[PDB]
Structure formats: structure tokens, C-alpha cells
Amino acid sequence: ARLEINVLKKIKEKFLCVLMSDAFELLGKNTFEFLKENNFQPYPLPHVRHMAYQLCHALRFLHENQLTHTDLKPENILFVNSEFETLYNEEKSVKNTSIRVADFGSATFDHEHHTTIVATRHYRPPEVILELGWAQPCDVWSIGCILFEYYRGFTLFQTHENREHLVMMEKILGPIPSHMIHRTRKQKYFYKGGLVWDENSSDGRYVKENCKPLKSYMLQDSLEHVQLFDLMRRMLEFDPAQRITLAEALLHPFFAGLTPEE
């Protein structure tokens, strides 16, 4: 099943992706390894900004060429060089914050058959869970979750099951748009428009204690933090038709803080 090779060849011909030589180039540790190798202490905002910029550029490229990745997660984003400079206050900070997007094994073309369920759970969007169909906006959702993870050090949706996941989504982002609820065949999750959920269950207890409205995860109050969260909340729009595109995301005030080298 090296129809992966095919995608890689189609991609090369059109580029912050890890692509083929014939296997490919070796790079540094991935952005999750680095997180774990640093106690899950977040990346500082400037790193998060440069990484976000690169991600949006990388996938805007796929997205404008009839491709969705479907499996973006911190494990598939690679530092070109993960050499770091430890500093006491001990936290680690990577030297060169350039990244590459990897693993096009799941990348799907517009015209290809779309499997119902795609993405790794924590990075999977509501349209997929509710089986409303999916395309490029899938990746944008994943990118929102990933940026949050870079900025706080922990997963946005640390979940194991659909119902819980949906409850976490409402907890953090507000209620699911009613039209999406009317449209899904997955009605077993709902009653009179409301997610069926026992708050006294162990998971229900986890969510009450640990999931809160998105803005409340802001570490600092500076403009740059406010903008990152404005951009994240647009990437984590429930409705894929209304969710921001990566072309649009790059025209966001958040990226004003980039160096011109960056």
C-alpha cells in the first residue's frame, strides 16, 4: 500500500514537508518528544508563533492542491534540528524552531474515497465524530488543538470516547450548533438537543474539574496572547463551513510578532 509514495511524488512536483529522496532525510526530535523530554512545559509564545506560521503555510499548500493530511498531531511535526539551550529559572528551549510536516500515509485527495473516521482521536474534529463528512477543514481543527498543546504543554481533548469528547468540546468552546445536531445520524448522543451525559461519572468528574472555557487557558494578558486565542478559537469553530481556512489564518494579526527571518 505505497499509494503513499504516489502522494509524495505528486507533492514533490508542486514545501515544508518531509518528502522522498527515493525513506528520506533524518531530522531532529518531533514536537511531542521535545515536550515529553521537557516535562510537558509549554513552548514559549514566539516559538509557538513561528511553528504556527510554518504549519499554516505547509498545509495551505496541500489544501490548495486538492489534498487533506488527516493525521496532523505533534508527533508528525518534526524540528529540523531539535538541539536545545537549557536555561534555569530548568526549562529547555529549541535552538532552531523551524519544522517540517511528516507522514502523508493518510493524505486524501478531493476526488478519492473518504473514510468515515480519520485523524487521531485528540485531533479529530466534530464533523468526523458526528459523521457530517470532512475535507480540508479537518486539518485546521487539528492545527488548533496542536497550537493549544504547544502553548499549554498538555492535550486540549485528553479523551478516549466520542461522547466525552463532544462534552469536552461544549465545555471548552460552547454548545454545538443546533443545525449540526439536526444533521447528524449519531442521535444516540443527544436528547432534545442536549448531550446525554452523567456528570457524576468518573469521566464526568474529570471534565468538571479539568475542562473550562478556552479563554481561561490564557497564561498572560498581553495582546499577542489574546490574538493567539482569537486565532485558536477560529480554528476550533464547530462548523467546518464556517471554520477559518489556512489562507485566512495567515492574514491574522497574531503573525505581526514574527521576525522577518521567521
List, by residue number, the catalytic residues: 71
What's the residue count for the chain?
262
Closest to 224 (Cα-Cα) out of 249, 250, 251, 254:
254
3-class secondary-structure state, position 221: coil
CA distance 108 to 69: 6
| Strands in 85-164 per DSSP E | 94-101, 108-109
Contact in structure between 212 and 171 (CB atoms under 8 Å): yes
Q: Which amino acid is present at 1?
A: A
Parallel, antiparallel or unpaired: strands 77-84 and 108-109: unpaired
